[PDB]
Structure 1
Amino acid sequence: QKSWIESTLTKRECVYIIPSSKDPHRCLPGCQICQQLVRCFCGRLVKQHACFTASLAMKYSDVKLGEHFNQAIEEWSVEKHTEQSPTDAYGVINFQGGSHSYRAKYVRLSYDTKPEIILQLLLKEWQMELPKLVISVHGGMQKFELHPRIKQLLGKGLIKAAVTTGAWILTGGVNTGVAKHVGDALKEHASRSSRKICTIGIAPWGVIENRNDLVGRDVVAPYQTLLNPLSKLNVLNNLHSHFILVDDGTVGKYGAEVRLRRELEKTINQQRIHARIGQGVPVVALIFEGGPNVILTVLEYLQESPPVPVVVCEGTGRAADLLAYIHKQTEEGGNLPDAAEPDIISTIKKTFNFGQSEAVHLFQTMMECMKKKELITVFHIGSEDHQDIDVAILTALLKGTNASAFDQLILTLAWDRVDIAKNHVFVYGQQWLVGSLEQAMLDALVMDRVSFVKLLIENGVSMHKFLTIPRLEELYNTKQGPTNPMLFHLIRDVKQGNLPPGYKITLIDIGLVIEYLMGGTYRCTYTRKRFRLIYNSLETKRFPYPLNELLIWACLMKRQVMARFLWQHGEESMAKALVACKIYRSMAYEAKQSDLVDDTSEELKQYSNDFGQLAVELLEQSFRQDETMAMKLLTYELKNWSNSTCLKLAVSSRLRPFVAHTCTQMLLSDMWMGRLNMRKNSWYKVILSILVPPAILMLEYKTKAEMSHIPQSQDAHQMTMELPITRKFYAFYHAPIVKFWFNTLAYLGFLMLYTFVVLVKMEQLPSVQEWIVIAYIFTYAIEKVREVFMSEAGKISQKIKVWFSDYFNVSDTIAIISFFVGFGLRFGAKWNYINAYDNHVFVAGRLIYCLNIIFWYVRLLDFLAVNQQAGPYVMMIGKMVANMFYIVVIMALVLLSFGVPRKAILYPHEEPSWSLAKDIVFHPYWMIFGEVYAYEIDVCANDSTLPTICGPGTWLTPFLQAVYLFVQYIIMVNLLIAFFNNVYLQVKAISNIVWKYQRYHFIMAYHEKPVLPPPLIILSHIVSLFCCVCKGPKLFLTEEDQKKLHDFEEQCVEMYFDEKDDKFNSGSEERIRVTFERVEQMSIQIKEVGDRVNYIKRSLQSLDS
């Protein structure tokens, strides 16, 4: 059969052919009509039975000879005499209507289908999400209309209640009653909840217009939506999405839904609403505008074990306005007022024509309903009762059902309704157990229910006591929420490449992941001795700063909205933002280096930049309050984040807006100075003092207080306690600005000598100038090896890889290597010939020198890059070379397109030679630079300098050259000008940021560079090394200064959020919309008062007479 439906669900065709009631209509002979008119008590004319078994009964006379002992005519049973056979129709109807087909579905099951098969039909066969709520509406059929007030509202709440809770709305479906009002409410809120509300019409296969159009095994039957006139039959309401048509009986009989629909209301409740949650799915009932068998149904749902609560919207119709008042004349759960038989049964007789023959039977159903009014919620329209029934529906499940507030809270948690819990569960006088609000916190975190975490923290959950090792372990291991698949990919890459079967994650492994992501020398609290010891042993089993540990959790689980929330709680907000930026950046990288499908490297790179911006914006806030305290924030050790600093974390994440911020640039400038006040001093007194040492004693140095915001070496901070004479020399020569000019003068003197060497004739032995040059480069080279093998990151292959990322270190490496090739050839060359330049090994050596010196003039751009104006232009030059590449490739092609024809036309008698490669490129290149070779253009002219080249075809080359230069100058050179004009500002801007950023690494370098410059640096190498055998900069703060700084951080974070709320609440767009909404509200009350004052006019009539 290739279908679970075809093999499971059935039809109910009336095989047995009871004649109609007894009597023929007319038409004296009783053989034609006893066959023709006389339908079956099934409910159809005799030939429609089409009994595969008894098809030949009608031809004879019929099944079941007439007389049959009248008793045995009612003996027909839907149970017995009805062959259970396949479905024969299950598919997809449509509804040509309000601009959409508004598709739907039907199964057309029998009736006595088991109850479980529905749940299996609904969830896997139809692929429907199990709901968190079930609204079972009821009422009467074929009523005209409602007040235009109530009509708009009932939907608005019914929709809201169902969309916010993923609810099912069980209707009859038929567009002659309850379903109509449901559907008419759907279209007023359609294309907003058209994919969250799965309404279901459990209607019969009886009363319906075109039962035969619904037929068809696996069909897409195009069902109508026009009210077929001249009839009473009803249509399936278009705006429903699912139908369970019930094949039984016949047309007209519509009673076979209570047995099935009710079971569905019973079987959904035995399902668990969520995995983490143990409560069953709730069921509610909204009766509007009802009838007599509804009042039976209301009491049948209240009396049930457990009770299904009830909503009653007064004024919709009889049963609503009735019950709303009939359970108003009563004690809370007891007896009625002064004898109420007259007025109650009066309306029960007026609404329902009874006359005491059925007027007690309803009143007896009423007095049972009032035994439980706590479950009959009633929506008092007029006096703004519970605001758009969603509260009234949902709170009815939270009104009296002797359910603990823990269960009242979880239910809101599964619904994702905070407003309900805060206003109706966290009510005054409410009382809680000890870890009920803890278990509710564990659920809200695992479920990513961020707004409930807020509600519980406020109401008094404490994360210091809540969070524990095993709980925090669980939060990583849960598969009951929006997990991150990639966390395991990072764990298995740090463990050994493998994983055990289930592998409940450990926190030491989380610690290992963070170290891999945070990189460098980051060592996490989870991989430390004490944690590694205590965890083996698993207040001791708490955490001192739990929101640092959950921020990490939320960021490794890719739970950003929870991360942002948790970030705003606790301390060290700027640091946490920078750690989050680094975690996400490193996660984004390994996602970009994994063959998985959902790359998530722009989602993570965007989350990194979101926290990156937060750190930058907190820095600006701090800088606007106090510059000196903001600079301290960049460099204080954190002690909860591996003793790093906020600036080092930002540099780790390559976060340029933070490092290029004027606060960070102000600090870097102060560290450049050292102890020197370079506001009272001038750069020429520094240079003068490097050459005149005794002038060091007449500079304006800085006090220990002026240095309070500046990180220092341990040796440098001990000489702050006082300024004696020898301390002042220390302060000078250890300042980075001094080391710079001290190395810059030595470098300039190095180039003057090396320029002298290459320009002056070279003898066998190197001159004194050449020896000094070699000493510089040798010791300069050792100095570079020192810098590499003492950098940061432990791993040589990472130290290597970072250092060779800088342009000038690649060039310096080439410069140093090429030099000693040159010195080797120059010095190692044996002179067999007395005239130098007869010895080629010598020449190759000298020519390497003359080319190696280019590297050393270009390194002056690195020194010049220390200036704020010059440095960006140096960075621009390299960026513009990269960007202009393809314009230059096109120019190179134009050059060859001219060069090859020119040479071929003018030199037709050439043999193969490498000079051909020169000649096709040489003159065409120099043409770009203002050389037209004027007396070579027309080689056959009298003024030609190439008269022997005159020959056939040579008249073509001036035309070629004219075209060539048009293309190069008039087009390509000016395109390049236009290129540079138009990208200048964006390249200059990027280059300023890069200049400012690379200023960190430059200034930090000169704190570890020796005092002495590269010729005399060898002493600082030998001595320092030898003194180490005989045996970074930190900010030092007093305990009171740590206090005042931690308070400064907190104050400025508070200012930061206040200024945002007040900037958003004061914008015109926000004031227009609050004005918009408040004018919307008034426009109701203005009219409402308008109606009241028009009904105080009713007073004027009655009062005055």
Structure 2
Amino acid sequence: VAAKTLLIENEDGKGSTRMEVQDFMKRFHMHASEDDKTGSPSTAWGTLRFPTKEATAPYLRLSVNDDPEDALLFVKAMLAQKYGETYDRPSLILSVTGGARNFTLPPRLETAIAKGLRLAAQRTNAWVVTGGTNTGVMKLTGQIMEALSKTQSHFIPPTIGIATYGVIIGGDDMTRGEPPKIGLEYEMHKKDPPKTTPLDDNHNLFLLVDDGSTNKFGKEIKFRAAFENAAGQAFAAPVVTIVVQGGPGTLGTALQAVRQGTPIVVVDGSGLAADVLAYAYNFMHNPLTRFKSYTIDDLRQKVAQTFNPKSSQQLTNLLDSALECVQDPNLVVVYSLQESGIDEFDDCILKAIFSSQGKLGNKLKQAMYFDQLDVAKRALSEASKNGQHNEIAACINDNLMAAMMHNKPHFVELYLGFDAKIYELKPSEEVAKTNITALDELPSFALAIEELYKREAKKPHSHVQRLVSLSNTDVLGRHYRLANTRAYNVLRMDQIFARLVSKDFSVNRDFTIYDSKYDKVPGIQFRRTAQASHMLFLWAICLDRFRMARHFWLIGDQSIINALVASRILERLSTHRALQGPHLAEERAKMQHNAKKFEELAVGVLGECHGSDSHMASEMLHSKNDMFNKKNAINIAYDAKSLAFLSHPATQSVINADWYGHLKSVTSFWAVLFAFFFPFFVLPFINFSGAHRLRRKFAKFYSAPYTRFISDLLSHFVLCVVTSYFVLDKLEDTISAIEWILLVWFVALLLEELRQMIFCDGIAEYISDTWNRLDLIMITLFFVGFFTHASDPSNQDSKVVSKGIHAFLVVVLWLRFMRYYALSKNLGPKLIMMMEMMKDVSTFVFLLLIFLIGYGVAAQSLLSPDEDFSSRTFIGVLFRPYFQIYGELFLDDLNSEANCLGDTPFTECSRETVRMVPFFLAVYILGSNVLLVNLLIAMFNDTYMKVQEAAEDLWRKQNYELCAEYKDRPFLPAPFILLAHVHMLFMRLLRLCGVHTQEHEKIQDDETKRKITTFEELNTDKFLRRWERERQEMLEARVKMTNDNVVQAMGMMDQLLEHMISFRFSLDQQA
């Protein structure tokens, strides 16, 4: 079943149009006989079902007088039927022409040539033009292309066998039947006259050149050379011809290659015409002393031995064709296993590409393939030493975006190190004029990053276009739920990163520093390199390329903040619904491994900052970044939410220095408690930092969060003591004054809870605090107890109902006093561990509960039957068994309720069936105090030994949060917090209505921030170097490079043994 519509490319080359298949191949023609100029309409084309080949290979019989552009359009239609319109464009045209007979080759030379051809087909995605023979040098190149097709998945490289229709083995049967031949069985073993060889069954496609004649070979050399010239003119690709052995037709192919300017590669030492070309390269081109013995007589003897001409004029024409093949030394590259080696065949292929004409963009763009850079570094050194600095600077931007396209980071570092700037990048296409001023203000390198995002979204099954398609934002970047063309601009990328990483981030994209009026500043080039490195770093995080983002994280600054934003961005990209799917799991796991790899390095950089200078690191961590929405890096670490960052002791020292504030940290808890007890008698005596300095010292004392912690703990302790004295006092007939004190006190706590709800960081976070929910239960049960007392103040029954609910309150009021235990070094993680441990007691309650109610219904059955059902029956089920697991089993009370009058207590009873009571007890008590009670002990030992370090890390995160919450809370205690809320409401009414309020903020100096930036760059580099010293200090990598040196010692051992065998053969032949 062939395709009904064919996507044919136009003459402009932009896109393809769907049209008819038979109208497309009406221009292609075949020839039944050699006398017809038009020949026939083409019907020997379609799909060939080869044996041992499940892929439907396209085959096409085209005329010798037909156009090569129609064959290129048929190859583009076969590529559009292969992988759609999103095709992999080739960059090399490798031709396999040579020995059609199955000649003799060395195994190591053919192994190195097949490995270099498979590496070139894997790297460049090259087009293989074969001769169509099933035997000879086309069979070994077809086996190398079949090994490259079996080795490499996804888009296979297309290999085309260019044979003749003159050799028709089933091609007359392919001409039989209506076109298109969908699923035609290509019988290569079927005998048709005068065909002698089978076709290229290992090729991905077949092209049969037709003249209508028969058993005449060499008629298609012209059409294969015209197709190689059309492939060189189509994709602007170089064409190199690989030659192995080779008969008489091989030489002419190369002549026609060297006359047209196509370079050729000859496998030297293979034999036949390639040995004659190697002898002609030894005579005419090689000036060495071992190659000095070759002359024209030895080349004429090799031409008489190899090709065997019957005539002397044919021997003179073969000698002129051998001299014409060695006439151009640039277009001839001879590769041998004894000369080049084993891993230098593909280097000779890249040297034959590199010996072309001097288009340096096409030279260096082809040089960034198969992980090799020493040819391009020597070419850049030759362009630097030649003085041609204009064309290298013209081509280095295209080489930089091509090296950033195909993930070659050594070529990225070689292009960036060769006097080039990454902020002066040009886009691939022109930028349209935007009506919005935000898109119009971006320069051309942001259009180049948007062209990289369009090339990343042009790949099929992309998560980038699914992420933009599930973003539901506008084209400017706001979430408002032309625009489709510019949807991959960098501001919308920054908004969909800042919505994904946290809430309420907006980066400072200062794009006005790229003007030339501000270009005379001494530090604006490092700032524009920092902005270009930050946008290319966010591009490399978005494509999840780890080494590219490591290099862009290296050349930029603020590495800790950018690494933590990238670690939270790759934490949250794995949890996104657009990046979740069937095939996204392995990329999400490797991207989470890259998230842990970015999580380790900034912790190590801040460890090197703590090893360098602790005071400069404390000045670093309180510096608010202007490009990170004026926030400190500890808040960025909180929105990163990584517990390994906050468990570092340098960040804990920054948190303790923010806890003590401007006061020095020599005071203990009792010294600050005595200073809060005696303010006027200790504040000139304290060591901190005429009456204005003491007033500034008192204002620095009461602005500390630890002073507000002591004031809030003393206010809650005074509440709990005065409220417990209210509960234990007898309520009178009138309203007492201490109830008015607790009413105004708890109305001030209700105003504090309304201030905590109105100025909240989200309403869902206010519910998610446990202690604010306990404050809600606290204020609600005080309003129920106040309304129950004030409904009827003279009734004693309403007073004891009010004290009976106030008992539940004063149970609740001492459970709020856990919160001031969190700043201790010992109470905190054990309290967090107790709140973790409550789930294991709840499953202990869920395991005993059915034992409890089963023995309770058995004990209430056996203790008192023949009785009716009541609430006392529920008391007989649940009350007495529950306290038997705690110690006071009530066995004398069961003797009194058992109605037995014996001396030993269960004898002489009224019933025989009552005595089983102690026996169910003997089982209930056994199980409860032996199994379950003991099991928990083993639960608590295992739960402690699992999550004690998670209790330490969540205790330190509670540390930052408290500091932040009691830096946020105003300094007055609870009784007066209503006067501070009245002063805050008067300040908000003065700011909102009168608008006379003003404030001043501390502005950081530029030289101080430059000192922090050079301190971070000196540590960043230092940590990287040490890691790189420590990464080559482990066992496994040094055993790995020792193993690679023993394998290269085997290679140098085999080269020295081959040189010693050649010296022994020269010493044997010398005498």
Displacement of 1:636 in angstroms is 0.8
Q: Which letter does structure 1 place at the counterpart of 2:361?
A: F
User: Which residue number corresponds to residue 11 of structure 2?
Assistant: none
Equivalent-residue separation in structure 2 for 1:188 and 1:503 (angstroms): 43
Change (3 A) 1:103 1:1079: farther
Please tell me whether the aligned partners of residues 750 and 779 of structure 2 are also in contact (alpha carbons under 8 angstroms): yes
Displacement of 1:203 in angstroms is 5.1
1:821 to 784, 803, 821: 784
2:51 to 81, 93, 96: 93
Change (3 A) 1:765 1:999: farther
Q: 3-state DSSP class of the match of 1:284?
A: strand
Equivalent-residue separation in structure 2 for 1:166 and 1:884 (angstroms): 64
Please tell me whether the aligned partners of residues 213 and 223 of structure 1 are also in contact (alpha carbons under 8 angstroms): no
Q: Which letter does structure 1 place at the counterpart of 2:747?
A: F
Q: 3-state DSSP class of the match of 1:378?
A: strand
Change (3 A) 1:700 1:974: same
Once structures 1 and 2 are overlaid, which stretch shifts more, 767-776 or 586-595? 586-595
Q: Which letter does structure 1 place at the counterpart of 2:485?
A: G
Equivalent-residue separation in structure 2 for 1:479 and 1:674 (angstroms): 47
**Structure 2 residue 708 is the aligned partner of structure 1 residue 750:** no
Q: 3-state DSSP class of the match of 2:333?
A: strand
Change (3 A) 1:126 1:591: closer
Deviations 1:862-898 (A, max 9, x none): 1111112210111111122235644543443444455
2:619 to 619, 622, 632: 632
2:958 to 986, 993, 998: 998
**Structure 2 residue 431 is the aligned partner of structure 1 residue 462:** no
Please tell me whether the aligned partners of residues 119 and 267 of structure 1 are also in contact (alpha carbons under 8 angstroms): no
Alignment of 1:907-946 (within 5 A): 920-930=877-887, 932-934=889-891, 942=900
Alignment of 1:198-277 (within 5 A): 198-202=158-162, 258=221, 261-262=224-225, 264-272=227-235
User: Which residue number corresponds to residue 37 of structure 1?
Assistant: none
Change (3 A) 1:120 1:188: closer
Equivalent-residue separation in structure 2 for 1:144 and 1:508 (angstroms): 63
1:319 to 270, 273, 281: 273
**Structure 2 residue 328 is the aligned partner of structure 1 residue 361:** no
User: Which residue number corresponds to residue 548 of structure 1?
Assistant: 534
Change (3 A) 1:186 1:896: farther
User: Which residue number corresponds to residue 432 of structure 1?
Assistant: 390
Please tell me whether the aligned partners of residues 900 and 906 of structure 2 are also in contact (alpha carbons under 8 angstroms): no
User: Which residue number corresponds to residue 120 of structure 2?
Assistant: 161
Please tell me whether the aligned partners of residues 906 and 949 of structure 1 are also in contact (alpha carbons under 8 angstroms): no
Deviations 1:515-545 (A, max 9, x none): 544655544334x8x869999x9x5999733
**Structure 2 residue 1040 is the aligned partner of structure 1 residue 1073:** yes
Deviations 1:248-276 (A, max 9, x none): 9999777676476556535544543xxxx
Displacement of 1:448 in angstroms is 5.7
1:1011 to 966, 971, 990: 971
User: Which residue number corresponds to residue 732 of structure 1?
Assistant: 701
Q: 3-state DSSP class of the match of 1:854?
A: helix
User: Which residue number corresponds to residue 619 of structure 1?
Assistant: 606
Equivalent-residue separation in structure 2 for 1:1051 and 1:950 (angstroms): 94
Two-structure CA RMSD over aligned residues (Å): 4.9
Equivalent-residue separation in structure 1 for 2:791 and 2:605 (angstroms): 62
Deviations 1:732-769 (A, max 9, x none): 33333333223323322322222222223222344454
Deviations 1:907-927 (A, max 9, x none): 666767666666554445444
Equivalent-residue separation in structure 1 for 2:808 and 2:632 (angstroms): 44
Q: 3-state DSSP class of the match of 1:136?
A: strand
User: Which residue number corresponds to residue 492 of structure 1?
Assistant: 473
2:803 to 840, 846, 861: 846
User: Which residue number corresponds to residue 987 of structure 1?
Assistant: 947
Please tell me whether the aligned partners of residues 313 and 379 of structure 1 are also in contact (alpha carbons under 8 angstroms): yes
User: Which residue number corresponds to residue 482 of structure 1?
Assistant: 456
**Structure 2 residue 937 is the aligned partner of structure 1 residue 977:** yes
User: Which residue number corresponds to residue 764 of structure 2?
Assistant: 801
Q: Which runs of 5 or more structure 2 residues have no equivalent in the other structure?
A: 7-20, 427-441, 458-463, 991-995
Change (3 A) 1:1080 1:583: closer
Displacement of 1:1080 in angstroms is 1.8
2:775 to 801, 812, 830: 812
Change (3 A) 1:809 1:431: same
Alignment of 1:32-43 (within 5 A): none
**Structure 2 residue 1014 is the aligned partner of structure 1 residue 1047:** yes
Q: 3-state DSSP class of the match of 1:1010?
A: coil
User: Which residue number corresponds to residue 673 of structure 2?
Assistant: 687
User: Which residue number corresponds to residue 431 of structure 2?
Assistant: none
2:823 to 858, 863, 866: 866
Q: Which letter does structure 2 place at the counterpart of 1:308?
A: T
Amino-acid identity (%): 23
User: Which residue number corresponds to residue 72 of structure 1?
Assistant: none
Equivalent-residue separation in structure 1 for 2:351 and 2:31 (angstroms): 50
State the structure with more CA Rg.
1
Change (3 A) 1:436 1:771: same
**Structure 2 residue 549 is the aligned partner of structure 1 residue 575:** no
Please tell me whether the aligned partners of residues 778 and 812 of structure 2 are also in contact (alpha carbons under 8 angstroms): yes
Displacement of 1:813 in angstroms is 1.9
User: Which residue number corresponds to residue 708 of structure 1?
Assistant: none
Equivalent-residue separation in structure 1 for 2:1065 and 2:206 (angstroms): 49
1:1092 to 1059, 1064, 1069: 1059
Displacement of 1:969 in angstroms is 4.5
Change (3 A) 1:992 1:352: same
Number of residue pairs aligned between Structure 1 and Structure 2:
989
Please tell me whether the aligned partners of residues 133 and 281 of structure 1 are also in contact (alpha carbons under 8 angstroms): yes
Displacement of 1:303 in angstroms is 2.2
Alignment of 1:878-889 (within 5 A): 878-882=835-839, 885-886=842-843, 888-889=845-846
Please tell me whether the aligned partners of residues 93 and 104 of structure 1 are also in contact (alpha carbons under 8 angstroms): no
Change (3 A) 1:239 1:821: same
**Structure 2 residue 303 is the aligned partner of structure 1 residue 348:** yes
1:393 to 349, 353, 358: 349
Q: Which letter does structure 1 place at the counterpart of 2:557?
A: E
User: Which residue number corresponds to residue 59 of structure 1?
Assistant: none
Q: 3-state DSSP class of the match of 1:135?
A: strand
Deviations 1:158-186 (A, max 9, x none): 22222122223333465531134336657
Q: 3-state DSSP class of the match of 2:242?
A: strand
Q: Which letter does structure 1 place at the counterpart of 2:1018?
A: Q
User: Which residue number corresponds to residue 406 of structure 1?
Assistant: 361
Equivalent-residue separation in structure 2 for 1:303 and 1:743 (angstroms): 94
Displacement of 1:610 in angstroms is 4.1
Please tell me whether the aligned partners of residues 123 and 130 of structure 1 are also in contact (alpha carbons under 8 angstroms): no
Q: Which runs of 5 or more structure 1 residues have no equivalent in the other structure?
A: 17-74, 95-101, 273-279, 705-718, 792-797
Deviations 1:307-348 (A, max 9, x none): 332112211113222213314544799xx9999653432321
Equivalent-residue separation in structure 2 for 1:803 and 1:955 (angstroms): 57
Please tell me whether the aligned partners of residues 218 and 249 of structure 2 are also in contact (alpha carbons under 8 angstroms): no
Q: 3-state DSSP class of the match of 1:858?
A: coil
Q: 3-state DSSP class of the match of 1:524?
A: coil
Once structures 1 and 2 are overlaid, which stretch shifts more, 588-597 or 121-130? 588-597
Equivalent-residue separation in structure 2 for 1:727 and 1:946 (angstroms): 82
The TM-score, its normalising length taken from structure 2, stands at: 0.80
User: Which residue number corresponds to residue 655 of structure 1?
Assistant: 642
Equivalent-residue separation in structure 1 for 2:923 and 2:643 (angstroms): 48
**Structure 2 residue 87 is the aligned partner of structure 1 residue 132:** no
Equivalent-residue separation in structure 2 for 1:89 and 1:1007 (angstroms): 77
Please tell me whether the aligned partners of residues 905 and 953 of structure 1 are also in contact (alpha carbons under 8 angstroms): yes
Deviations 1:136-195 (A, max 9, x none): 112113445433442332223222222122223333465531134336657988964476
Q: 3-state DSSP class of the match of 2:266?
A: strand
Equivalent-residue separation in structure 2 for 1:724 and 1:13 (angstroms): 102
User: Which residue number corresponds to residue 277 of structure 1?
Assistant: none
Please tell me whether the aligned partners of residues 623 and 632 of structure 2 are also in contact (alpha carbons under 8 angstroms): yes
**Structure 2 residue 559 is the aligned partner of structure 1 residue 565:** no
Change (3 A) 1:218 1:301: same
